[PDB]
Design a protein around this ligand. Sequence first.
Ligand SMILES: C=C1/C(=C\C=C2/CCC[C@]3(C)[C@@H]([C@H](C)CCCC(C)(C)O)CC[C@@H]23)C[C@H](O)C[C@@H]1O
Length: 255
Amino acid sequence: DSLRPKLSEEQQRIIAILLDAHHKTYDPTYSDFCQFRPPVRVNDGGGSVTLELSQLSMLPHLADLVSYSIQKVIGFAKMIPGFRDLTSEDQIVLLKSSAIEVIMLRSNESFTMDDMSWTCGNQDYKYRVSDVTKAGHSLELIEPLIKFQVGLKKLNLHEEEHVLLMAICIVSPDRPGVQDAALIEAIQDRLSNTLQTYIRCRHPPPGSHLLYAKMIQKLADLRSLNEEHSKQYRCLSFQPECSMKLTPLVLEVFG
Ligand SMILES: C=C1/C(=C\C=C2/CCC[C@]3(C)[C@@H]([C@H](C)CCCC(C)(C)O)CC[C@@H]23)C[C@H](O)C[C@@H]1O
């Protein structure tokens, strides 16, 4: 019953651009990770907040990973059709507000349900819930984050849908501080329409069933994770000497 209009050439170009953008900005071999400050995992079987905050053993490495990732997200965003049509001010507002959410989205490629980890190479760059606690975060963020990762995994997104979702996430007209909400919304609509059209004509059943709505729900989930991350980041930042364990970029985006 539902019509399946074909992707317009323009929509085809948009998909090609976003796939190219992602391939240039996401390394599925994790080959740069050895350049980050080394992961350190202190003995913390009990999950002691006092100990976690006293050491922040995993923080330098995860801060470097996140900082690196923000740089990649900036590069990806610059390639979203329409993004450069925005004022610099609006571009920066969108990047700073969406960065952590896009990181959570893009991390799904490395996430595995084999053991519920982000596996980015050997035992060294395998990141578990216990590694995030060692960077000063609490289960109130990490457990819904893992749940989100599983939920996202199970949508079995085509890469086309994955890159569209990240672009839609970034170009959101409802971020605090945006100037030209109408232009951002127009850019987002073009992407949303591409995604909806793609799903309807290129995504096989039964995985296509209400997929667009499930993807929109993930965006809402990300808002919640963003809010919790920000709250926890604030508290983490109270730890004396914490700034040294972060990066200038991380400090700007989250401070
Ligand atoms: C980054 C990427 C990756 C994994 C993401 C992870 C695993 C470690 C813990 C992270 C980084 C989460 C953690 C809660 C962020 C903590 C950030 C600070 C600044 C400490 O408050 C969010 C996403 C998680 C690897 C992937 O290949 C690239 C992706 O950008």
